Paper text:
Members of the presynaptic neurexin (NRX) and postsynaptic neuroligin (NL) transmembrane protein families form the axis of a signaling pathway that is crucial for the formation and function of excitatory and inhibitory synapses throughout the brain. MDGA proteins bind NLs and control their function and interaction with NRXs via unknown mechanisms. MDGA proteins are attached to the postsynaptic membrane via a C-terminal GPI anchor, and their large (∼900 amino acids) extracellular domain consists of six immunoglobulin-like domains (Ig1-6), a fibronectin type III-like (FnIII7) domain, and a memprin, A5, mu (MAM8) domain. The extracellular region of the NLs contains a cholinesterase-like domain that forms a stable interaction with the α/β-NRX1-3 LNS6 (laminin, NRX, sex-hormone-binding globulin) domain (Araç et al., 2007, Chen et al., 2008, Fabrichny et al., 2007).
We performed an extensive crystallization screening of the NL-MDGA complexes formed between MDGA1-2ECTO and NL1-2ECTO constructs from various species, and succeeded in generating diffraction-quality crystals and determining the structure of the Endo F1-treated complex formed between cMDGA1ECTO and the human NL1 cholinesterase domain lacking splice inserts (hNL1ECTO; Gln46-Asp635) at 3.30 Å. The hNL1ECTO-cMDGA1ECTO complex has a 2:2 stoichiometry and overall dimensions of ∼180 Å wide, ∼110 Å high, and ∼120 Å deep. Two MDGA1 monomers flank the NL1 dimer to form a 2-fold symmetric complex. The NL1 and MDGA1 C termini point in the same direction and thus confirm an interaction in cis, situated on the postsynaptic membrane. Each MDGA1 molecule spans the NL1 dimer using two large, separate interaction sites located on both NL1 monomers (Sites I and II). The Ig1-3 domains mediate all MDGA1 contacts, consistent with previous domain-deletion experiments (Pettem et al., 2013). The smaller Site I (859 Å2 BSA) is formed between residues from (1) MDGA1Ig1 β strands C, F, and G and loop CE and (2) NL1 loops Leu289-Gln307, Ile377-Asp385 (part of “loop L1”), Gln392-Tyr398, and Phe496-Pro499 and helices α2(4,5) and α4(6,7). The larger Site II (1,000 Å2 BSA) is formed between residues from MDGA1Ig2 β strands A, B, D, and E and NL1 α helices α2(7,8) and α3(7,8); (2) MDGA1Ig2 loop ABIg2 and NL1 loops Ala110-Pro132 (“Cys loop”) and Asp361-Asp385 (“loop L1”); and peripheral interactions contributed by MDGA1Ig3 to NL1 α helix α2(7,8) and loop Val417-Ser424. The PheNL1430-PheMDGA1154 π-π sandwich stacking interaction is central to this interface and is lined by multiple hydrogen-bonding and charged interactions. Furthermore, the LRE motif is present in the majority of mammalian AChEs, and besides in NL, it is also observed in the cholinesterase-like adhesion molecules neurotactin and glutactin. Both Arg450 and Glu451 form an integral part of the NL-MDGA interface and interact with Tyr187 and Leu190, respectively, on MDGA1 loop DEIg2, offering a first functional role for this LRE-tripeptide in NLs.
Author numbering:
A (entry chain B): 19 to 37, 45 to 139, 147 to 178, 184 to 377, 381 to 538
B (entry chain A), C (entry chain A): 358 to 576, 584 to 633
Amino acid sequence: QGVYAPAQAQIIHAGQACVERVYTIREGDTLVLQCLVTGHPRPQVRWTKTAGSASDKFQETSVLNETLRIEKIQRLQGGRYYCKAENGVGVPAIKSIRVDVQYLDEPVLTVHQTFYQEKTVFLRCTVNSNPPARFIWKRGAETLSHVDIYEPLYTQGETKVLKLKNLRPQDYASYTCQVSVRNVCSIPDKSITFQLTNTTAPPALKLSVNETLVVNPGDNVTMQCSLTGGDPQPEVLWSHSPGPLPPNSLVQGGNLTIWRIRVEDSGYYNCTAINNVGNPAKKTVNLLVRSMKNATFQITPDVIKESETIQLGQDLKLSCHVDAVPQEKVVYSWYKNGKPSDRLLITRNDPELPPVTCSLEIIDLRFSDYGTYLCVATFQGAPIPDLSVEVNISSETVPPTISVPKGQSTITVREGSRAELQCEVRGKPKPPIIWSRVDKETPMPSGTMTVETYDGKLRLESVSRDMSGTYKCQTARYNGFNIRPREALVQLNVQFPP
Amino acid sequence: ELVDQDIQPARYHIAFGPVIDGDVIPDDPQILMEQGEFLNYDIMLGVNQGEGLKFVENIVDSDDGISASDFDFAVSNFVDNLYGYPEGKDVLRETIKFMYTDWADRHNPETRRKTLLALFTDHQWVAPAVATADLHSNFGSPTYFYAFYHHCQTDQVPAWADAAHGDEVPYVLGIPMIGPTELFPCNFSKNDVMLSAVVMTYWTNFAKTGDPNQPVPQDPNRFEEVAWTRYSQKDQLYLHIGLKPRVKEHYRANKVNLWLELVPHLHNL
Amino acid sequence: ELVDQDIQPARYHIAFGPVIDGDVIPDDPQILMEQGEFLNYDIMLGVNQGEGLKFVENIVDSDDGISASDFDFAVSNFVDNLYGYPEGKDVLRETIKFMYTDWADRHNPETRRKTLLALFTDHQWVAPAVATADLHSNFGSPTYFYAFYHHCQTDQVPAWADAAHGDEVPYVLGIPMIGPTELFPCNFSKNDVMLSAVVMTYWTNFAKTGDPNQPVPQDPNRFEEVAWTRYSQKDQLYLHIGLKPRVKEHYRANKVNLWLELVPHLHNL
Ligand SMILES: *[C@@H]1O[C@H](CO)[C@@H](O[C@@H]2O[C@H](CO)[C@@H](O[C@@H]3O[C@H](CO)[C@@H](O)[C@H](O)[C@@H]3O)[C@H](O)[C@H]2NC(C)=O)[C@H](O)[C@H]1NC(C)=O
Ligand SMILES: *[C@@H]1O[C@H](CO)[C@@H](O)[C@H](O)[C@H]1NC(C)=O
Ligand SMILES: *[C@@H]1O[C@H](CO)[C@@H](O)[C@H](O)[C@H]1NC(C)=O
Ligand SMILES: *[C@@H]1O[C@H](CO)[C@@H](O)[C@H](O)[C@H]1NC(C)=O
Ligand SMILES: *[C@@H]1O[C@H](CO)[C@@H](O)[C@H](O)[C@H]1NC(C)=O
Ligand SMILES: *[C@@H]1O[C@H](CO)[C@@H](O)[C@H](O)[C@H]1NC(C)=O
Ligand SMILES: *[C@@H]1O[C@H](CO)[C@@H](O)[C@H](O)[C@H]1NC(C)=O
């Protein structure tokens, strides 16, 4: 190719700048970079950026334009940009440039108090700035070693501390941290002052409720968090974990009220006071709303005889469980065609099975034991309702078996439409089915590894090809026999156009 | 009138106490020991795992942890009070912080508390004790060294605290054998009695023969087969006194040598 | 004519090699990495236990040990060449000597050899590698870190040497599977073949999926139940590659942080 020439790029500076390879501008101004290019055929030009996907100044910024334009630039918009120019002939042309947005936030001034001869206060001054800031201390007059100044470790020049080793009376004055960025990009210095007095003291709080607070649903609970010390006057703030405070909870400021409290509102509510003096004070209360859910039973045939079925002359455990908030406070009652038990039939409250599960054993099973058993979980004198689980034992009760009906082992569907996977379980009682995926370890439409279902149906509203694969269905270990779960597989084809 | 006066000394120092008069105390103990200007007594000495509890107890937040800023402050106060050198205190503070920083789990405020406690413990108790033991044994004094890693926690001390300054006294005095006292109210356990018996056996054995192992054997007693070897500067063997006792070597050698060899060097001679 | 010329560079540096031209290499790698000015590739990196064998191999006496004076000399040469600072090299040399001195068994010339070797290894290989891994993971690059603690000793290397620079190459290339070669004459053992298979499995797994654990499982093979967790600056998990493999945390955290945080500070900013 005689005349065809490889691309050649050159970056030029424009828009607002300040003062070699780097383009420094003040935050809020406008960036204008132009990429002049040559070569034949005329190469195309795109400005792009290079930034770690998962941290700090990152944007996905691919513009097809010989001019890069960022109006009202920001901290994060900063970084390294490269102009790429190609035309097919030879190697693409690349030129790099570092845009260095500069700034100087308002400094923060905090102070801390502290043998037994001299009292010492530390005045810490912190500020975020680009470039690194310069600190100057003054007590009306500029201070030098004549007390000590320095930068501690675990600070990249953003912090300086003024140490007052001996706190003499003249030192009780207004200290002001004046931080400068060398006026580069014509950026003004900034100052913050603090009134150091012998009454200056960190915050302190008092809470109107105990460490841990138990409550019933619907109850209204109000918590007064009041200051008991602090100069300057600290600011009190409430917070919640996990998640935010509302709905149905309002902060007057100091006063925290929760109306018609729901069970999900349980958790930690922390009151914190701050005045930029010492460590902030924090009072913490753990609010527990009572609840009972998911009552479940288990049929456990003779384990030592290695049985999976009810057989006369064997041990038969009938367990019971419920999920509760004050888990330690639950109590179970076992009824049997009415409410009775010493000989032959015995109670056991805490075996290897899930936590706090009451389970009676029937030694030497007998036709006389064939009946309807009931377990009743309750809270000692709580307004909440009781929960129960019925479990009929009879000659009919039998461990389960699972299979795929007819020939729906492999079921094909077109993408987008709805899909319905099917397993059918047999036994008395029938436990729920737990669906999982086997070809890979991925989650599901519900977003978790497994889904519960009683009808043995797995419904897929918007079936995606990603779902195409193999699926496992198996019997639960609860609400039925506590036995090796029975398994069965089904294939799911998600057809899609070519 | 003299007692009620308020006389505050420099931090970590004393106002009224023993002085170098050139008679009772012929010279600086450091000089006398380095030059071996002392008779050869039989010596037994030791320190506790967490001597410096009170050093950090006052700077601990409501979460039982210490902030990075508080840590810096403590060291800063520490350097100024003990190392009042005008030129070079900066490099010192930074070096000290690095050594007593746990770079594995460096962000944990509670680990920060432990290492800070260790700094004060190492400087005020461990380093001087090792220096004494090293010089005594080197100059021919029969030496025995111990580290006390046990105590009885009262409801007045933090649950996270280890054996603190003075916590060995009750064991040495056999207080556990007569149960809790008005002065020592901790609910001593069977293990406390057992350990107390052991300490008293070792202490009185030393008094009887100059050997903690003679004449009374340690008679389940975990010290049955544990002979307390003499301390020497080369092997620096010491007895680890606890519920799992055994002889070890070079107690905190790394941190001890920092204070005894490197820091003095940074003084610029 | 150009190749045969004698051009000696500064010690521990190069004369002819990659340069910062502002185009191919936009800026100092240190600045680019600190400011996260790089794309997020999948990264795997590591170092060997005893990289710096040749660093001390030449100063070892007939007893396989290093004298205290030779140790001082090596450090002195080390400080001057890498840290050409006029004011303060004294405190630096002394601090470096202290950190790399084993105060438990401080008189052993052979232990002295090991720690000196570690100094060069830590500075030239471990510290830079950790810095790279820390920055890559911090900026979102999937990172995997390893430490190679195995090798096949030929009759040409000292019996006391650990895995040296380049010793992992034969395993990565599967040389043990085809037996000793003219280039790699070591009499590879069954364990060498097993480890070689493992390394190749991990390396190619990374290439296939970006995950050393997928898709080929480690199929007695001691890596059967050992999943290589991703590296992060907080936990800094890495794979210990040897005949007893397992995942650890914060590889040589203490010594690594010395070079990456404290020493730079001693520069006086
Ligand atoms: C109601 O409560 C029952 C507990 O009585 C819940 O059943 C439990 O479900 C979890 C996860 O679905 C099971 O965890 C399992 O742990 C084993 C550990 O060996 C593991 O191999 C399994 O893959 C699974 O992760 C747990 O075993 C199971 N407990 C029993 C007794 O079956 C049930 O999910 C709750 N349902 C609702 C709607 O609240
Ligand atoms: C390039 O961008 C500038 C402003 O960013 C615009 O004025 C111009 O029309 C654009 N031209 C092309 C060819 O993209
Ligand atoms: C503090 O200063 C005030 C002056 O406002 C003075 O009245 C007081 O005695 C001083 N001492 C204390 C402990 O407040
Ligand atoms: C809770 O407050 C509502 C109004 O805010 C009131 O009607 C209700 O009776 C209160 N209930 C309790 C249990 O305090
Ligand atoms: C409240 O404090 C607890 C510990 O006391 C802590 O686990 C929780 O994260 C805190 N919540 C908030 C919002 O600060
Ligand atoms: C607390 O604040 C709520 C609103 O936030 C208010 O309705 C209630 O009357 C207040 N009670 C007290 C005791 O402050
Ligand atoms: C079990 O027996 C009880 C006894 O009244 C009956 O009500 C129930 O329908 C039976 N079947 C069950 C619980 O599935």
